[PDB]
């Protein structure tokens, strides 16, 4: 990825990543994080 | 699906599902809505 400016452009960062075997387990943890973090905030929103 | 009491399960209903042809895509939509629903209730929390 790079920081694009008005008619000049320069390098920001890069990762030589290495993928993994579990598309599902990854997506599960992402969804579970959201649904938990959602729910805790609606509890706080009631209390406040 | 079923409800359990009197130490046994009791069917409440049934569905014909169909396996979905575009799996990763409806998953995309779902995690977008969840990331929104975090951010929305988080914004309400800060205000409260």
From Swiss-Prot, chains A, B:
Belongs to the XRCC4-XLF family. XRCC4 subfamily. It is found in: Nucleus; Chromosome. Phosphorylations by PRKDC at the C-terminus of XRCC4 and NHEJ1/XLF are highly redundant and regulate ability of the XRCC4-NHEJ1/XLF subcomplex to bridge DNA. Phosphorylation by PRKDC does not prevent interaction with NHEJ1/XLF but disrupts ability to bridge DNA and promotes detachment from DNA. Monoubiquitinated. Widely expressed. This is DNA repair protein XRCC4. The chain holds residues 97 to 144 of 336 of the full protein. It is linked to Short stature, microcephaly, and endocrine dysfunction: A disease characterized by short stature and microcephaly apparent at birth, progressive postnatal growth failure, and endocrine dysfunction. In affected adults endocrine features include hypergonadotropic hypogonadism, multinodular goiter, and diabetes mellitus. Variable features observed in some patients are progressive ataxia, and lymphopenia or borderline leukopenia.
């Amino acid at each position: 990825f790079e920081k694009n400016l008005k008619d000049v452009s320069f390098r920001l960062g890069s990762f030589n990543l290495e993928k993994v075997e579990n598309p599902a387990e990854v997506i599960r943890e992402l969804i579970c994080y959201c649904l938990d973090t959602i729910a805790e905030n609606q509890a706080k929103n009631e209390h406040l």
